Amino acid sequence: SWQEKINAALDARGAADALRRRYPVAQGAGRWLVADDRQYLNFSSNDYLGLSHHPQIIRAWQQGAEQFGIGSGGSGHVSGYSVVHQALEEELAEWLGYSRALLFISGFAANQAVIAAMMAKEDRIAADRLSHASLLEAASLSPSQLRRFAHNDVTHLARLLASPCPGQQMVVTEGVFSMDGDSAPLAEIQQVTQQHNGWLMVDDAHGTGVIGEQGRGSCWLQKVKPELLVVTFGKGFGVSGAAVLCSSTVADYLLQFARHLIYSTSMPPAQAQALRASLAVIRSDEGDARREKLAALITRFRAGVQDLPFTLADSCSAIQPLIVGDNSRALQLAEKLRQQGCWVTGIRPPTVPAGIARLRLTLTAAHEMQDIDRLLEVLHGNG
Ligand SMILES: Cc1ncc(COP(=O)(O)O)c(CN[C@@H](C)C(=O)CCCCCC(=O)O)c1O
Numbered sequence: 001s002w003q004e005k006i007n008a009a010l011d012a013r014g015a016a017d018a019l020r021r022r023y024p025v026a027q028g029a030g031r032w033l034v035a036d037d038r039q040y041l042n043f044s045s046n047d048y049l050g051l052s053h054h055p056q057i058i059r060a061w062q063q064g065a066e067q068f069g070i071g072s073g074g075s076g077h078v079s080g081y082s083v084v085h086q087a088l089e090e091e092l093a094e095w096l097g098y099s100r101a102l103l104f105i106s107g108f109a110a111n112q113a114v115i116a117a118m119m120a121k122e123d124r125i126a127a128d129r130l131s132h133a134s135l136l137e138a139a140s141l142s143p144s145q146l147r148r149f150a151h152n153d154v155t156h157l158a159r160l161l162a163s164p165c166p167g168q169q170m171v172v173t174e175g176v177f178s179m180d181g182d183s184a185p186l187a188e189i190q191q192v193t194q195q196h197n198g199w200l201m202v203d204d205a206h207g208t209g210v211i212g213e214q215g216r217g218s219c220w221l222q223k224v225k226p227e228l229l230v231v232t233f234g235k236g237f238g239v240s241g242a243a244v245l246c247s248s249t250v251a252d253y254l255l256q257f258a259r260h261l262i263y264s265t266s267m268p269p270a271q272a273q274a275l276r277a278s279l280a281v282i283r284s285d286e287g288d289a290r291r292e293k294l295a296a297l298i299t300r301f302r303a304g305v306q307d308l309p310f311t312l313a314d315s316c317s318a319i320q321p322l323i324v325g326d327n328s329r330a331l332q333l334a335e336k337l338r339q340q341g342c343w344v345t346g347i348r349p350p351t352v353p354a355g356i357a358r359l360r361l362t363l364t365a366a367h368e369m370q371d372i373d374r375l376l377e378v379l380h381g382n383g
């Protein structure tokens with residue numbers, strides 16, 4: 001019965017210490033975390049360039065409310081398509097070298113709407129095995145067939161694309177992977193994708209704004225233009241939302257068939273003004289300064305881990321993992337760090353694969369070398 005169904009499931013999660021509870025925070029983004037009116041250095045957020053508290057971004061969010069009120073009033077297919085929404089999309093499309101952009105309320109929504117609109121039961125989705133849960137979930141629910149290729153294995157991907165297919169195939173991967181921080185062999189991936197008349201879909205949540213010239217992300221940097229690029233704004237951009245970069249025809253296609261775009265309220269125009277300002281910083285000289293400082297900090301942290309008995313879970317991005325060599329995967333070293341002012345976190349399956357529960361540390365440009373020195377200090381010891 002319903003409650004038995006509920007209760008059992010909850011019981012199974014308990015049994016693996018797979019149980020998640022939220023902790024309420026006063027501040028969760030950027031240099032500092034504030035919890036229980038207790039300040040910690042924050043190594044758990046996704047605010048990679050420290051824009052969540054940029055004065056200009058804050059101001060565009062406030063002024064926009066002054067100008068546009070809050071709610072958009074409806075769907076972009078009725079009276080909810082603001083000129084500010086339009087401008088943001090044009091600016092995004094201009095920035096990344098695409099003909100069109102389409103705003104979504106979230107990255108999760110964008111990925112699922114694309115995969116749902118475009119894939120049919122005859123089709124195939126070849127996705128990296130560590131692709132984000134919104135992609136895999138959706139490809140899973142899709143009536144299309146889903147095949148995963150081993151992480152970054154272009155050989156394997158080739159084998160899956162080569163397999164006789166009744167319909168079309170979509171390759172999907174990430175620019176900067178969620179949990180490991182590594183990148184995908186994009187030029188190599190796109191060439192086998194192309195060889196099989198595939199289309200490539202790249203999710204650059206974790207690279208967008210943070211690498212490449214003008215922070216244009218993983219695809220620009222690597223000289224690849226996937227037919228679909230998803231960019232999401234709740235990380236480096238410091239806000240919320242997402243967009244789908246694509247051609248004019250695919251764009252038109254997505255406007256007809258992507259329910260999340262048709263049957264969902266558009267974002268408040270003021271949120272969109274905030275995103276445009278964020279884009280401005282990211283493409284600005286301040287944008288470069290922030291990217292370079294983040295790189296400086298990564299270097300610093302990474303060199304520091306050399307004198308340490310841990311996993312330098314080879315990452316050049318703001319994401320620096322640490323697999324679990326023991327931890328009521330839930331916590332420690334995690335707590336030790338926490339008690340010492342370094343707010344860190346334990347990431348466990350199903351989010352992570354296997355005996356792979358971990359410390360997913362993230363650096364940001366809001367941090368300072370003395371913050372990193374401390375996290376180094378505390379991983380090393382001191383008290
Ligand atoms: C690669 C990637 N793509 C898309 C999205 C979704 O975009 P959105 O945030 O705008 O909807 C994210 C989210 N990454 C973050 C938000 C997570 O997936 C958090 C996972 C936390 C796991 C917690 C646990 O395992 O206990 C992302 O990591």
Ligand SMILES: [Mg+2]
Pocket residue numbers: 132178
């Ligand atoms: Mg994620």
